[PDB]
Each structure stands twice: as C-alpha cells, then as structure tokens.
C-alpha cells in the first residue's frame, strides 16, 4: 500500500509514503494566464445576476420593476436553494430611512428585520427551525446635481462590538435584535460607564465596521455600491449561509446588512441636504420545520 509521488521541486524525482494508522486524522498533511485582469476565484469577488447565467423582478404578488441589474450581485456566486437531498416568502418593504450630510451608516440583521412581516414572521415563530435565503433591494434616488456613494455590505455572521469596557460579549438579546427598525453606526466609541445599571448594547464604530476590522476591507464581503452619479439602486441575492443546513431563526441571525456612506451626500449648494433610502427585502427558497405552539419573545 506504499504511495509513491512526485516531490515538490524547483524548475530546472519523488518520495514515498505509507499510512501507519487507521484514522485519517492521524495522517500527515497532504500538500494538494493570457489576461492578468481575470479573477482566479470570481465567486469570492461578488458576481452579477448576469455573471453566472440567471426588467420585472417578481415573488408571489410582490414585484420590483428594474432596468438597473449590472448593479446586482449574487453572494459567493451562489444562488439560493432548497434544503435538499410559499407566499409568506415575498417582498417586504421596511421603514424608510433618511440619508443626510451627517449620517454615519445603518445596519440590520436577517431574519430579525423581517420578524414581523406578515405570514413570514408567523411561520418563523411557530417553528423550531427555519431556513431562508434573501433578495435585498436597496433603493435610493437623487438628482444629476446630487452626489454621494453608498457602500452596501452583506456580512455573514455579522457579530458586532458592545458598549462596555468592563465586561465583554454582553449585549442583550433585545438590543442585539432591533427588528425592522434598524440599528445605526457611530463615528466614535463611547464606553457605557454606568456600572450598576448597564445599557447592555452595541457600540458600532463606522471605520471599524462595528467589529474591529477596517471598513476599507469590508469589500471582501458580498457587496454592492450605489454611486448617485451612475445608479439609484442595488440588488443583493443572498444564499443561506451557515455551519448547519438549518437552524433556529429566533436564536440566530445569519446575515447582516450594513449600509455606509463611502462618499458623503452632497447637493448643489444646500448646507444640509437629505435623501431617502428604502429597503425592500424578500426571503427566498425558504423552508420551516418543527411546528408547535408559538414563540413569544421578550423583545420589550
């Protein structure tokens, strides 16, 4: 059973191997042009609804009307799919937010943001387990005389940093889960000094993506940019991502949506402009499991 193979050589002969043990774990580590501009691993680079082979975007009775599409991205090059081997899952439009010359950014979590959306939300709380992918459609228009740029980031397991410097990992379930409402980024860290009666919530610094890493590198995550000059909307198609095939939607949030001003909003000459950002999100290829009496969370 001796295994002979080519040695790791320079560029101007081989070695032999025998496995002594029954468990593979015991085994030694087995070590494995024209156009430079081309990506080695495209999918890791944020492809388009176009770029993997896949306008009126429609789910159930809900439907987006979109010319914008080169502005879309399929996370990790992977399209949503059923746990293999429903019109509760449709497009829900969340409460519109306002972008101003001084906004630092906004965040949301999935499924959390959708927890009260019609039959979807119901299905979520009546079952132990649930899984779902998403289509995130960020809407934000302005004039040809306005300027600015939004960075729309979809982060897997988006754990955010807390307000305390005396204790760690202590943000309350209530605070961690804002629902549709949102949750927002800040320009500076402000430690919750109230010892006795703790705020127990996140303190997300913008240039650190609220998680201890530099915002400039947030682009290694599935993302899209809204440049007011060229486009008014972004569409992110998100797959179910997890260390499990299915999980508790109530205990665990799979994806995080982060929206930050890469370039600040500016208009004509007004000292203080504003424009709306509307998020319409739809759950995809979704399925639930382990039906029983309804979960009634202490959200407060």
């Amino acid at each position: 059973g001796a295994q002979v193979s080519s040695q790791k050589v320079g560029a101007h002969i081989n070695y032999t191997t025998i496995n002594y043990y029954r468990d593979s774990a015991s085994n030694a580590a087995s070590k494995q042009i024209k156009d430079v501009l081309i990506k080695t691993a495209p999918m890791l680079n944020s492809p388009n609804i176009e770029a993997c082979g896949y306008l009126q975007l429609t789910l159930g009775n809900s439907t987006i009307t979109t010319q914008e599409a080169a502005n879309s991205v399929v996370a990790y090059g992977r399209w949503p799919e059923y746990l293999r081997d429903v019109a509760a899952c449709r497009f829900y439009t969340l409460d519109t937010v306002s972008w101003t010359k001084e906004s630092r950014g906004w965040w949301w979590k999935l499924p959390d943001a959708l927890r009260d959306m019609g039959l979807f939300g119901q299905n979520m709380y009546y079952h132990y387990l649930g899984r779902s992918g998403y289509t995130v459609h960020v809407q934000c228009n302005a004039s040809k005389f306005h300027q600015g740029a939004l960075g729309v980031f979809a982060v897997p397991e988006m754990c955010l940093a807390g307000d305390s410097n005396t204790t760690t990992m202590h943000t309350s379930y209530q605070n961690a889960n804002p629902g549709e409402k949102g949750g927002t980024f800040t320009g500076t860290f402000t430690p919750d000094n109230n010892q006795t009666s703790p705020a127990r919530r996140f303190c997300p610094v913008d240039y650190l993506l609220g998680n201890g890493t530099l915002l400039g590198n947030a682009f290694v995550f599935p993302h899209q940019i809204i440049n007011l000059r060229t486009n008014n909307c972004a569409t992110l198609v998100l797959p179910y991502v997890n260390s499990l095939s299915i999980d508790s939607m109530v205990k665990h949030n799979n994806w995080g949506i982060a929206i930050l001003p890469l370039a600040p909003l500016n208009f004509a000459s007004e000292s203080s402009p504003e424009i709306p950002i509307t998020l319409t999100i739809a759950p995809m290829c979704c399925e639930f499991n382990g039906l029983r009496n309804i979960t009634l969370p202490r959200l407060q």
């Binding site: 240039y207 915002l215 004509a268």
Partner: protein, 238 residues
C-alpha cells in the same frame, strides 16, 4: 530487533514538520461536510479582491472614515499632484492595511502585477480628465505632470466613465521583492494628476470625492510564510 541507527534531528520538535501521529479519539464518526457557499482555497484568492485605499492618512483624518476620500475640485488647471504613493504593497502606510497588504505581511516575498482602480463619486453634471501614472524606480519621484507623463500612464475621462482601472505591470530587477521597505527591492511611484480640469455647471457642487482601490492580478504570488507585525499580545508572555 531490526538494527537501527539514530540520525541528527532525532527527538526534535520542528513546528513546521509534517508527520503522522496517533489519534486520541479512535473510530470517531465525523460529521459530514455540507456545501457551504463561499469556500476559499488559496490566500491569494483573497489578495485578488479589490479593497479600498486609506489615501489620506493625514493627522486629523487618519483612523476615521475620511482617510478613504481623495478630494477634488473645479479649480483651475495645475500640473501638481492630486496624490503621490509608493509601490510598497506591504510596507507603505496607505497600502499596508488593505486586504492585499495584510496578506502580504504573513509572507516575506512578493511578485506580480498590481491593479489600481479609481472611482469618481462626484455628480453627473461634473466633467473632467485625469492622468494616472506609474513610474518604475531609479529616478526622482514625480512631482509634476510633465514628468509623470513620461512613464506608464492612463488618461481617465471622468465624464464618460465613472471609474477607471490601471494595471501596474510586474517590472523588477529581482525575481521577487521583499515585504518591507528596502531600497534594493523598491517598486516605484504611483501618482495622479489633472489632465484638463474638473468642470461643473452652476447649481452644482464644486468639490467632490474619489475613492481608490487596490488588488492583486492573477499573475501574483508570495513566498516564505512568516508572522506579522500587524497584531500583537505585548502583555502576552510566551
């Protein structure tokens, strides 16, 4: 008893070794893999992802969301630099902390073509032409369009298209360059200029921002794995 003789190296522990060892949990039935989206097979795959450059590491705006914005204006034509940067992907302050730069710091040697991309975040009514330049090492670093012009360059038309990519092709005397500032393996100079000037109409913003990005091309590689300085435990004790 098969007659054996111990050689030098015997009983040592090399942290980079690759040998078999007994299993502490015999017959353990492993949980099967699932097809998780987003698998990475090589750190270079990551280095090839465009991340955003902290260009303005100025005293007052470093370590803030501002360091990322290069400001331009409708001001009169000048041959002076919009931004000057050195091709030291791992050691230059502006490049070093980008995803490319960070990976480069877990290694000692790099080689390959870099790819710079600039994004114009000003308004639609804004127009202009910029000159992006790369100068291979060995001469005075370009302080004026006139000299930048002489090296590898691209002319970017803002009005026509919002973004612009320039490839800095691998050109070096040595086979590989070091991931540290060192004259012997220097890489040259990237600089940006106004070709014509930014022009806007009335009722529109006279100042705007450009964002810039860097990543590695597919001809790129690194060698000699090493520990990084970009993190530490000073308080540690090992």
């Amino acid at each position: 008893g098969l007659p054996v003789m111990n050689t030098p190296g015997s009983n040592q522990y090399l942290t980079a070794d690759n040998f078999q060892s007994p299993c502490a949990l015999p017959e353990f039935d492993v949980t099967p893999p699932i097809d998780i989206p987003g698998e990475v097979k090589n750190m270079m795959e990551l280095a090839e992802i465009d991340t955003m450059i902290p260009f303005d590491l100025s005293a007052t705006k470093k370590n803030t969301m501002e360091m990322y914005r290069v400001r331009l204006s409708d001001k009169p034509h000048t041959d002076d630099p919009i931004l000057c940067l050195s091709l030291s992907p791992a050691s230059d302050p502006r490049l070093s902390h980008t995803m490319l730069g960070e990976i480069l710091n877990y290694y000692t040697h790099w080689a390959g073509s870099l790819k710079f991309t600039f994004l114009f975040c000003g308004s639609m009514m804004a127009t202009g032409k910029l000159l992006v330049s790369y100068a291979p090492p060995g001469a005075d670093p370009p302080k004026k369009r006139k000299e930048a012009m002489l090296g590898t360059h691209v002319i970017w038309d803002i009005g026509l298209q919002s973004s612009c990519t320039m490839v800095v092709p691998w050109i070096s005397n040595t086979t590989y360059r070091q991931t540290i500032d060192d004259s012997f393996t220097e890489g040259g100079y990237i600089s940006v200029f106004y070709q014509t000037r930014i022009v806007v109409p009335l009722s529109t913003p006279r100042e705007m921002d450009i964002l810039g990005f860097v990543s590695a091309c597919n001809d790129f590689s690194v060698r000699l794995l090493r520990d990084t300085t970009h993190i530490e435990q000073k308080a540690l004790a090992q």
